[PDB]
Scaffold this motif. Structure first.
Motif, short mmCIF file in Angstrom:
data_model
loop_
_atom_site.label_atom_id
_atom_site.label_comp_id
_atom_site.label_asym_id
_atom_site.label_seq_id
_atom_site.Cartn_x
_atom_site.Cartn_y
_atom_site.Cartn_z
N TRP B 13 0.80 -0.81 -0.22
CA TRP B 13 -0.14 0.30 -0.42
C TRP B 13 0.85 1.44 0.01
O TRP B 13 1.69 1.05 0.65
CB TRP B 13 -0.92 -0.21 1.33
N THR B 49 -10.41 -2.49 -8.00
CA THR B 49 -10.88 -3.89 -8.14
C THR B 49 -11.75 -3.69 -9.38
O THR B 49 -12.79 -4.49 -9.45
CB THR B 49 -12.46 -3.42 -7.19
N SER B 61 -8.30 -12.80 -6.13
CA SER B 61 -9.77 -12.44 -5.40
C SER B 61 -9.53 -13.83 -3.67
O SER B 61 -8.67 -13.22 -3.58
CB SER B 61 -10.45 -13.56 -6.31
N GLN B 63 -10.84 -12.00 -0.80
CA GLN B 63 -10.66 -10.86 0.28
C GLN B 63 -11.92 -9.56 0.19
O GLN B 63 -12.39 -10.18 -0.14
CB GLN B 63 -8.68 -9.97 -0.32
N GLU B 64 -10.88 -8.77 0.97
CA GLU B 64 -12.31 -7.78 1.71
C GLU B 64 -12.92 -6.54 0.04
O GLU B 64 -13.85 -6.86 0.04
CB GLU B 64 -11.39 -6.20 2.56
N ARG B 65 -11.84 -7.56 -1.13
CA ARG B 65 -12.07 -6.65 -2.54
C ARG B 65 -11.66 -7.28 -3.55
O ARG B 65 -9.83 -7.74 -3.41
CB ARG B 65 -11.47 -4.70 -2.40
N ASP B 66 -12.19 -8.30 -4.56
CA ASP B 66 -11.91 -8.67 -4.98
C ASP B 66 -11.61 -7.52 -5.81
O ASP B 66 -12.35 -6.81 -6.41
CB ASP B 66 -13.07 -9.97 -5.60
N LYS B 87 0.07 -5.16 2.96
CA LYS B 87 -1.67 -5.41 3.02
C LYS B 87 -1.91 -7.24 3.05
O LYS B 87 -2.87 -7.27 2.52
CB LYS B 87 -2.46 -4.88 1.65
#
Lengths: 100, 107
Positions: B13, B49, B61, B63-66, B87
């Motif tokens: 990040w 995303t 794929s 996770q919190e956001r694909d 992250k």
């Protein structure tokens, strides 16, 4: 009328006024107005990933670990020359050493 | 106390024409630990995303956001300066595929 489109092996010139070598293929470059390239310089500091560009008076070395995506059409680019298939295969080699 | 140093496969990040900004933003690290540590630089590709179905996207794929790593977008960046943080990491699958596509482009 026809605009220069960076081709793989080309050494181009850009802004951000700095030389680079284009590793991205002509079609990708043309469609995306982007290319993958590595920066070149008049100064060889002996860093290992430096790839000597032949006998260079101007633009002496090409940094293969510095690989990057730039928008060649956006910042504009012109053709400073091309690169020996040797130097190209090599540079891709190093880059592979790092990324592979 | 030792600073986090990004490793090959790590999802980081970053603080971070130069379109991509996303002041807090994801990337997939392609450089091995040694190099990153020595140089304060790393090679990585940006994540988003938003899938455009673009041919150079690689799915990340579960996770919190694909999301997609954008694999034509490889960048040499200075992570120490830009304050990279961990992250989590990418499946060996995903990393391998990233490398592969990059090969497509430069091979």
């Amino acid at each position: 009328v026809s605009r220069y489109v960076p081709d793989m092996g080309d050494l181009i010139w850009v802004d951000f006024h700095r030389p680079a070598v284009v590793l991205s293929p002509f079609m990708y470059n043309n469609k995306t107005g982007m290319c993958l390239c590595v920066p070149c310089t008049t100064q060889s500091k002996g860093y290992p990933f430096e790839v000597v560009l032949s006998g260079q008076e101007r633009d002496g070395v090409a940094l293969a670990d510095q690989v990057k995506s730039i928008a060649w059409r956006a910042r504009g680019a012109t053709k400073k020359g091309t690169v020996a298939p040797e130097e190209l295969q090599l540079i891709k080699a190093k880059i592979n050493v790092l990324i592979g």
